[model samples]
Target: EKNVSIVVAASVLSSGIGINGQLPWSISEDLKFFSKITNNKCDSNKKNALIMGRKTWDSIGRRPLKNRIIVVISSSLPQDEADPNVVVFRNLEDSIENLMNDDSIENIFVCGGESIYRDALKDNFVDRIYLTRVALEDIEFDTYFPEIPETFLPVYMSQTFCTKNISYDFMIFEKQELKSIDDTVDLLGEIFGIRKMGNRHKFPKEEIYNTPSIRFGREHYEFQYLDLLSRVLENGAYRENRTGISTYSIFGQMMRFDMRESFPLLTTKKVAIRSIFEELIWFIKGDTNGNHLIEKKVYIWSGNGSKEYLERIGLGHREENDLGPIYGFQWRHYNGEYKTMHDDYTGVGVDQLAKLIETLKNNPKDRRHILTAWNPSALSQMALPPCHVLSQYYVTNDNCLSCNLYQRSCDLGLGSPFNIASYAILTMMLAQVCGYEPGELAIFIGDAHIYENHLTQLKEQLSRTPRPFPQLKFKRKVENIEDFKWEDIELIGYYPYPTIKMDMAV
Candidate 1:
């Protein structure tokens, strides 16, 4: 096969990898093993790259190690000048991109600060691991490495020894390609099954201020909404709406919202409730292509997907029509392929999506039954891969199934509103399939923001009083989650304030 040959590598400790910001006692020996593999001398000109977490970069005092390219993983990293030897990455995918393009880098070394290690391991990116086992009895630590996969049989080890007042031994592990995309797809298929097709409602334009020129107003509304988000997040309270349009600043987008208190998308103006709902369902379906959405008459994706399609078709950047693999492409089909899952033919025959439905139906009470969307290998395929990367379904003690979404990043102005309603809809659908009632939808956003332009309108919207949330109604009572059809679900009594418009960040 014609493909770039890349070797994945990592160095960590057996006391797990990270405990708080420090590596375990075994880390020193693991470092020695890594040094053995890379050749001890760290030189500025050496063809090697070391990827580490923000904590690791900070621990090294911001100085790049000699001769090796240092890449730091962080979303909140300061853009100011750092040591000339250090390069900072907002995400692991960013670091990987640097490595792939750097001809000067020979071997890639993944040195943990902790989150990076977990992310790399979960994505199955570590081809070889230099793991040092420390003979420390159970001690308290905040971070830890998950158990190595069974297939990565031990290949080498050095005699156990004491170093720096710590007892440790060096061991090496090599990973085997045991998982395949077909497996994951099948798993999703079996877990969620085909979402029960429900009666489709023609969204009437008249109810939403019927007009052919609604597009302009819609755009303005969205922009205003973004502005409101910026202000709300920045000021910790609603900003007064002066004008109907607002522009978003970078600071507004980077502001953090209190997930414990208010829902990020609650605003005075109308929320795109249906749009949010459909988008989440679209993702849960593990769809890489947008043709399905387009056929359904949804156009919110036109801006980004259109450009990506053009790019993939070899059109220049100036081309009018282009849409490449966007978010779904990365989450569902990274590097032109899907992630791994167990096969249906195997006894565990169920994809994550399909299995979710099954669990809702059979084990709706189980908290472990959750669907995950963060596919590490596929990150490079997204226009901007989803910030709400992972979401889970939990059967509450009250017998209600709830959803918790984790967003690593978000443009509060442009994305948070959609995210809130989207995950809520997902929880609703899961509840519908499983025979359980709907429960709370919890969202965690790492970075949330609002644009400046829409602030005035948002303030106005917020003052208008929150319109009642639309009630989700199903077409018919499905006996089991697996038996749900698309025609069974319906959006009812949803009177949103109005469409808010925002500029496409891209």
Candidate 2:
């Protein structure tokens, strides 16, 4: 009967909750989330109670929130006979007591005014804290959120969200008595050969950049990638690779992202949007001329496609700009006979992309809706073997499209980020063509490794907090996926930290 939760938003730097009697700033998503959380209950027959002080009551225009019992904690406000849902109590304890006695109150939510929040936590009645950490501190605030008690551990934190350029995220905090330990720590440290395991205080301290307390379970998605960096740093084994630069490798890694919310672009560093899109378009068009990317000022392929590199890789007889049966070639013309870059080999090898698009449109439930770039028969003749080997597309019963990719070897630093965004865009484009909404993306990798040189850059990247993933919307409907151009795509709300420079080990 004492189960209670606190739902509040405060500044990330300053503990500011409000500026006069109203919120310091307005956020569309937060308003919706608050309403959603307060109204959510397992028992549809019973409603939740929102307890607030008189000032908070007045700020909301004294209106009774829909489908909720408003228990206003104040001595000054008069009881209203018009709404039975709107109840007035003299104090916090009195309001809680009344709710406990009432069978109709399924749960209790302490929806704010600083004094009530302080009193709720002080009384040790809060079961959970739903904190929205707003990344704003320039504005002055009158009412403030109380310093969170050490007993309450942050169990869940979302990837940062942004509105009007101000970043924020949802975090869940629960009392320490509800959670974990240290002694078996020493045994595990010895067993796993990790010294830090014994000294672990939950997780790494990225306080200079992100939240200090560790988030448990599958995180805010961006953390899915960041945590990989942390894991590779902690558990990676040094190995010499073909590139001769060496790498710290870890096997079998995966990241999942929700495309319906935002594009799965890395927010920690400013990824090159133009280069990625242009390269993807180049692939879709089945163009293997390395000069095409360079012509558009996208130099990402310059190292791998260089004449010297081609000669070194035993493709010496090939033309300077000719990249033999690369990603674009295999994506469009799988297992096609090799020829010069200038040859217009139309209707040549199996068009996997065309088949993929057709299958998705006709048989949305087909399990074999796959697009593969790996051709064992053609690998020896190619300038480079495909790193991202295959992708399978799925159309949900609810009319949403999702994609799952299998990559053989991935450079977690420079490559995986591009792969995530590339696949996300691919899924979105496929969804549009197939008349469905973009759904989720999951990338399964065989070797997820960081170059030895990139360790410092990645660690620096890990030190920086993530902002919201940006939204990408195609401005026009295209007849074909190959028809997409740079002008057709619009990237919205991408406020990322400055780009980190890491060399591509080719």
Candidate 3:
């Protein structure tokens, strides 16, 4: 069957179409849009068909549109066999079927009167809508466009445009086909029920799985993060990465987390909040010694800091677990000269973090509170390049602190959650040190991806609903930013689903 698209322009407030058998307003741009959209044809040999009711046919002066076949639906009008470009049908359904059967017609457009639109919508014959909203109200009109049905949802709304000092907007809506709940349940059950089907082995508790109710938001800010994951799954591309696995990747994505009421930690699956805190404190202390983290039992950095891994990347002379000039080094000493991990870096490059805090305190209104960990000159020295790079801070008028971070590469399953919690806690730490309450956290990412091996795990995580974000509290305010320790930070009210462990790409 032919794809049917409806095109109409109506009054913004009144939804009026015409006055006294003519358009109420003359917007040359809208007319031009109508002409261009209806005339668009991919095949030079074949032309499109414009289906309209008899009144609409009369409104256009019974003249045939250029490069289009006019099919008029009129019960009283005589069938005109003389004109090759014009045809008459008794009703809308018959008109559609006739056009669909026509091999020469490339596309079908319902350019209408109110009756034709209502009939087309009632019969579910239309696939999409191109609506132009003219910003005029309290006008005289005998005919009006019918209200769009609930089945049609807006997919695009264009920016406002002006013609002759009259504002207007172009919009497109498509029929939304919703997925059935039974289908989703069946798919989930099939995928997860393999090992325990009809067996004596005990299956995992159902509470660990995600339900529809929890698939969205427990807090307002929680859905923003979950929606990003949904968007990636819907539109991301499959691409091979530096590791053995492939990923579904997308570029230029951002997620905002609110810090006013709660901390932004993933409750879909249990996150290692303690390890995240340890890593942040490690970064703040300006320590590049991976062994320090290992001593504290935080092994997230251990994979990159291994002896064989270090030598394979052409750092044979350096000692094992010495991740040189990474996040903390760049934060405290921007351009520090590096010989080995043990060399003295007392009076090195610019101290960006120290300067950042100073600026935030002294000039609260300043627009340049920035901290960067991606140093180009020091890339060769580090064991692994920084994934979460530049971070900028903003102090609100009410003495609230907000942050924006840019991450170059993000592994959604393994790295993104850690990065979110890490930066959020970092923002809080900075906020406390700078004498401001926590406000909001925004993270902008490049190359956001979900590894192939983590698909089932991530899908399972997605099945679970998000819970309320936990609160982050510091036991005592410290005199120095580096003075904060693990015991000082506490995460409260974190009730998450059973943890799903996915292997890192490294």
Candidate 4:
């Protein structure tokens, strides 16, 4: 056949394409979509053919439809030959093969009841799937579309639309294909400059992973994060890490989030702005008492600072809740005082955080506005080594403070989400202190990974639609960066999907 595609709409959760011989919901635009897609033909003389089970044919009314021929699949239909706009086939494959034999048919669509769609796909006769995902759920459905084969990848997704008090969106799926050894050899070389492949032919079926056919063409920019996650899933390889749990990791990936208009908090999952904001304050205040964050009902750091964990990591010399010379230490003390995390001594090494504020305010063009936390000599004492290694701040000519952060190892499911908001908040805090507005936030990670256990959680996260990013506004003007508190921040229109819980690797 020239082309055979599945044209159908279904409830998002149940994949319920229809009820008993009727649609679960009426969508006027979807009818227009079906008409526009199935009736399309390159040659004006040839009309497109729609193949459906006899039940679907009757459901649309027995009268022949206009501008296209409908092939009904049923064993009981009488063999009538005169009608040019219709045909009868006992089975799906026969109709497809018969269509391929006919020069007058341009393209074909397996417009369906559940059985027709399942047979067409199960028999490998479809090239594309035009899926309309309805948001309604927990309803009855007798005709459910079969689950899509994992060999198919979603290539396009339209923005969500609310019509007639119902929410829905459109997406397209295509079959995934594999490449040869030379194809991948050059591909690998171009991506990371790798060695020649040892094998000659293509990889096994399971080894064939297809990249998302396109970057998100959807409405919002935050979809870029989901696109990156897709890329990670497509290209990531199973690898070992410090945590006992293994991971699927890709090396040297970067993402930039523009903060000129909206905040960078992820809309797909409900990020803990409260906990994230509390942690940022803890970092800025140069407080290393891990329990202080817990004292405020934020337990993000307790996993690493636990007595058992510290003893396991050979940091038992430190106190129970002391995260020695960690992020806050490197910021405020910076090897100064050679002292306990809580001690504020007079003589010490460079106070990078204070010095950064001065440089940003006085010499906005200074290239040395850097705050680094990977102090090697002190790593042995800290309960947890910092994941975010360094941050470099640059002031744009338009009076905005932009930040570039380098993280050594990033947990994509848990830590990356926190890092984005935390750093975005930090940039805004510093911008206010420096008398400037917030700019863009850029992040570069050495090893961006998803824990083995988080695979299901992240895949679920990726399926969500991205909402508009929220705007962050500071409630008060603080003269010092350390004076800012979580309550001093306000997130306007910060609507997001329900949170997905994934355990921290620690």
Best by TM-score: 2
Q: Which ten-residue region of model 1 has the weakest summed lDDT?
A: 1-10
What tens digits encode model 4's per-residue C-alpha lDDT throughout 68-160? 998999999986899988889888878886455888888888896988988988898888899887766667988999999977877777655
User: How much lDDT does each candidate structure score?
Assistant: 0.51, 0.83, 0.81, 0.80
Model 3 error, position 126 (Å)? 37
Candidate 1 vs candidate 4, TM-score winner? 4
lDDT of 2 by residue, 1-506 (tens): 64688999987767799987889989999999999999989889888999999899999998889999888989977876778989888888877864458787888999969999999989877889998877666778999999988888777877655576566778888887712345566566667754564333234345322445654533677887888777677667889989889997878878889887677788789999889888888899999999988999999888998889999989899988788888878888887897788998799989889999999989999999999988899898888899999999999999999999999999998999999999898899999888999989999999989998887788789877565577788899998888888999987756678899999998
Give the higher-lDDT candidate: 3 or 4: 3
Give lDDT tens digits, candidate 3, residues 366-429. Answer: 9999999888998988888999989999999999999999999988888989999998998888
- Backbone clashes under 3 angstroms, per model: 72, 0, 4, 1
Q: Is candidate 3 or candidate 4 better by TM-score?
A: 4
Measured against the true structure, the TM-scores of the candidates, in listed sequence, are 0.42, 0.76, 0.58, 0.61
Which clashing pairs does model 4 show? 336-349
Over 4 Å off, model 1: 1-267, 308-350, 360-367, 478-489
- Give the Å error, residue 15, model 2: 9.6
